[PDB]
Write a structure and sequence with these properties.
Cathepsin D, subunit A, domain 1; hydrolase; crystallographic fragment screening; ECBL-96 fragment library; Endothiapepsin; globular; six-stranded mixed barrel; 24 strands
Length: 330
């Protein structure tokens, strides 16, 4: 089997991407944030504290003839941005782009933190990291991809995120029309539960490539590109007036600037992030200070190849017995 679904930016900045997902019988379609950095499929629901729902579409398990309470199971998750959610668990039928999994754990939110409530466009998350990170207790549950894998034509999914435009998540096949050149595959460590890999270096604009190993994670659920402070300083030094602002929370730059590109290495191959992809717009409405899309990872503990990087590539998440990642230009 295969599936193919369009993913759409939630706003004009590409702050996140939503993909429609069918849950239950009859189908209830929710727009979920596909997150290769986490491993829970959780949704706003009829169980979510009413004051914490503000415009989201909810899953109502009592209206699904295939929903079953997973007795005794609870979940609770905290994300790198400080947001969180928790609740109980159903199993139900879940379809993405024509690919169907029966008995998928659908984690129903009883509580969500303010940033989820405040984002009316995201009805939940669909985790695509390794199932070892799934938070369901006392019986850990499998991701949608893990459950689908054996049925897929090939045990892979691909992320093709757009810049200021829709893109595609495919399951079970590699669309050879969706990228240019060849796909360069690189090793993955699953020891932390992430799609963790080592970039071979970087360049800023037209500058020379610096060969240096940068371990980080391919994370569709993180907006920006988080890299070591040395790398980030080298990038922003090429932008007149750019500075790191403690009060804003990262590098800012004059909105009048033209940003240089940023290149990252995948083996001997190179992925070029155009400068425009690094512009996240005014820090507050009407400001002439703009927020940068490349930020320091120093306070995180891990480097994160988030959407800013991934949207410049066609990315293969290869879930073969030994997982690997593939990157192609497009």
């Amino acid at each position: 089997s295969t599936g193919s679904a369009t993913t759409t930016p939630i706003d004009s900045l590409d702050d996140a991407y939503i993909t429609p997902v069918q849950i239950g019988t009859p189908a209830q379609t929710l727009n979920l944030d596909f997150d290769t950095g986490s491993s829970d499929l959780w949704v706003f629901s009829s169980e979510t504290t009413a004051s914490e729902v503000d415009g989201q579409t909810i899953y109502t398990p009592s209206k699904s003839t295939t929903a079953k309470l997973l007795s005794g199971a609870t979940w609770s998750i905290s994300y790198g941005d400080g947001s969180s959610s928790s609740g109980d668990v159903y199993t139900d039928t879940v379809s993405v782009g024509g690919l169907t999994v029966t008995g998928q754990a659908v984690e129903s939110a009883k509580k969500v933190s303010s940033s989820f409530t405040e984002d009316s466009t995201i009805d939940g998350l669909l985790g695509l990291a390794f199932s070892t990170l799934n938070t369901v207790s006392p019986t850990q549950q499998k991701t949608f991809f893990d459950n689908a894998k054996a049925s897929l034509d090939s045990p892979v999914f691909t992320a093709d995120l757009g810049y200021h435009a829709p893109g595609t998540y495919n399951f079970g096949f590699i669309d050879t029309t969706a990228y240019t050149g060849s796909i360069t595959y690189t090793a993955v460590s699953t020891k932390q539960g992430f799609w963790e890999w080592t970039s071979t270096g970087y360049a800023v604009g037209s500058g020379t490539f610096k060969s240096t190993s940068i371990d980080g994670i391919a994370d569709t659920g993180t907006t920006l590109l988080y890299l070591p402070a040395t790398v980030v300083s080298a990038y922003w030094a090429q932008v007149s007036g750019a500075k790191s602002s403690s009060s804003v929370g990262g590098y800012v730059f004059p909105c009048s600037a033209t940003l240089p590109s940023f290149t990252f290495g995948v083996g001997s191959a190179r992925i070029v992030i155009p400068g425009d992809y690094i512009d996240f717009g005014p820090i507050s409405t009407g400001s002439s200070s703009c927020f940068g899309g490349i930020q320091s990872s120093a306070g995180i503990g891990i480097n994160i190849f988030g959407d800013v990087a991934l949207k410049a590539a066609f990315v293969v998440f290869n879930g073969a017995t030994t997982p690997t990642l593939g990157f192609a230009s497009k």
